[PDB]
Design a protein around this ligand. Structure first.
Ligand SMILES: Cc1cc2nc3c(=O)[nH]c(=O)nc-3n(C[C@H](O)[C@H](O)[C@H](O)COP(=O)(O)OP(=O)(O)OC[C@H]3O[C@@H](n4cnc5c(N)ncnc54)[C@H](O)[C@@H]3O)c2cc1C
Ligand SMILES: [Cl-]
Length: 487
């Protein structure tokens, strides 16, 4: 008889899950499995993203229970738990979604060899990205496109992505009863207290496939807002109702299908002939994700500078006093500190909000390496994607893809064009709630009586600016200008 395991890593969903459909096909027992390393906390990982993961597992648990099955959260290492459950459960087939990250290629190649020793068939369909990223490389001639213009031309030559897979049946084959490695007390979904986190999460974005689909339908209630979506024209200061979809945490963990997102967009574009085109359209945003996944998966040492063939070797400064002030949201610029506060509290910021803080830290003001600010992003971002977190930090630091280092955002003026009152600043930095809008972006310019009347004395309640932007940016641009000549 057929006993199969559907291994969940990414793709924490039931819709558009071809690895789950194959696992349930002609199966006597199906074992939904998610492997947890309990000593992750003892390695870097905020409670916001980890609890977002735990909520997505509880969402899978309720979905399997409604279909007569159950999710199994196995503790330990995968190269270790699988050889035991193969012989215990009488496994004949193992299915999981294809992953192109550097750690996964090592991990999955080890489980395949263990599955070959136990006589277990391995089926790894592709469903995390829009296309087969290795197929796009072969169709381009053996190398990945290095520009968005060339990559957009490539996917149009290939055509539409595969349609989202059918939904799984209403009744799934249950796991076998009285199996020791499937005991409910040792396979349940733990909370954030039991994994070792002492401070609770503060994000307002709840994980799970159900919330992802509800957040999808809400974005598609106005098809005219979807058809005319232009990314550079959105508001980074919009926090009550974010100007974009905020679907990145669900696309990272796989709670939402990229092919399902793509399909619904084409249904709206079909009825709106004047819809926006890449790279500014909503479809173009999924292409940015697909473009950076294709380049990073085929480029050695992509998340670093040394050994990276696409990254420029820049003479970044090793300044831990500027990195600390930027990391702890105490640079003295309320626009920068408010965004960094949203990073630690919500774990998500608007794309242009991530532009202002990444530019200020790197080529803009502080001239600190993009690898240092990345590690801060990989800790607090609930949507942190290995490949996407890289290319954008190399984009903002002018190390790759982007080479216009003369374009420097102003930490004082940038947020002013969207939010002259400073409503975004007063929310995440409540020490400046009473500061008048005239000095809310430059509090050090307010008279001392204005600082006292507002209860925000610069140097006592709110820090002074760590740098003069005019002097810092002028030096940073020039240093970046000679590095490009030596290139
Ligand atoms: C320094 C820096 C770091 C970043 N790190 C991450 C990261 O770790 N994870 C991440 O998902 N995005 C990252 N981005 C990209 C971008 O900021 C987010 O994808 C976007 O803010 C998500 O909001 P949204 O879901 O509303 O996107 P929308 O504008 O609604 O776009 C929809 C989807 O398209 C994709 N997308 C959008 N913009 C980009 C982009 N620039 N590059 C790649 N894919 C994109 C995402 O999957 C997103 O959910 C980073 C950008 C910068 C500048
Ligand atoms: Cl500006």
């Amino acid at each position: 008889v057929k006993n199969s395991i559907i291994w969940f890593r990414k793709g924490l969903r039931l819709h558009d899950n071809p690895a789950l459909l194959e696992a349930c096909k002609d199966a006597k027992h199906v074992y939904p499995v998610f492997v947890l390393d309990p000593h992750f906390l003892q390695q870097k990982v905020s409670v916001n993203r980890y609890n977002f993961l735990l909520e997505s597992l509880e969402d899978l648990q309720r979905s399997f229970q409604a279909r007569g099955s159950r999710l199994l959260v196995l503790r330990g290492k995968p190269e270790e738990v699988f050889p035991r459950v193969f012989r215990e459960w009488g496994v004949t087939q193992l299915c999981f979604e294809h992953d192109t990250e550097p750690y996964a290629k090592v991990r999955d190649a080890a489980v395949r060899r263990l599955a070959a020793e136990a006589g277990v068939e391995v089926v790894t369909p592709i469903s995390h990205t829009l296309y087969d990223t290795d197929m796009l490389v072969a169709r381009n001639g053996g190398a990945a496109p290095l520009t968005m213009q060339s990559f957009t031309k490539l996917v149009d030559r290939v055509g539409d992505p595969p349609a989202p897979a059918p939904d799984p049946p209403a009744a799934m084959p249950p796991p076998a009863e009285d199996m020791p490695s499937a005991a409910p007390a040792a396979t349940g979904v733990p909370t954030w207290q039991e994994v070792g986190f002492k401070e609770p999460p503060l994000t307002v974005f709840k994980g799970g496939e159900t919330e992802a689909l509800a957040r999808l339908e809400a974005a598609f209630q106005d098809p005219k807002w979807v058809a005319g979506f232009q990314k550079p024209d959105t508001d980074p200061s919009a926090w009550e109702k974010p100007a974009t979809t905020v679907l990145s945490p669900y696309l990272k963990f796989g709670c939402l299908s990229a092919r399902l997102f793509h399909a619904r967009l084409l249904e709206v574009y079909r009825r709106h002939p004047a819809h926006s085109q890449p790279p500014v359209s909503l479809r173009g945003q999924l292409l940015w994700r697909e473009f950076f996944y294709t380049v990073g998966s085929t480029t050695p040492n992509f998340h670093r500078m040394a050994g990276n063939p696409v990254c420029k070797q820049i003479d970044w400064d090793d300044n831990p006093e500027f990195l600390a002030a930027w990391r702890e949201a105490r640079t003295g610029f309320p626009w920068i500190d408010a965004i960094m506060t949203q990073l630690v509290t919500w774990g998500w910021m608007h794309h242009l909000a991530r532009h202002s803080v990444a530019c200020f830290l790197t080529r803009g003001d502080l001239y600190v390496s993009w690898e240092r600010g990345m590690e801060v992003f990989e800790e607090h971002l609930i949507d942190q994607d290995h490949y996407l977190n890289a290319a954008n930090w190399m984009w903002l630091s002018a190390s790759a893809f982007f080479s216009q280092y003369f374009r420097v955002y102003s930490p004082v003026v940038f947020g002013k064009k969207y939010d002259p009152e400073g409503r975004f600043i007063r929310k995440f930095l409540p020490v400046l709630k009473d500061m008048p809008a005239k000095y809310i972006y430059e509090p050090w310019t307010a008279p001392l009586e204005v600082q006292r009347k507002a209860g925000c004395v610069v140097g006592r309640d709110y820090p002074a600016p760590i740098v003069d932007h005019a002097v810092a940016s002028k030096a940073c641009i020039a240093r970046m200008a000679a590095a490009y000549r030596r290139s």
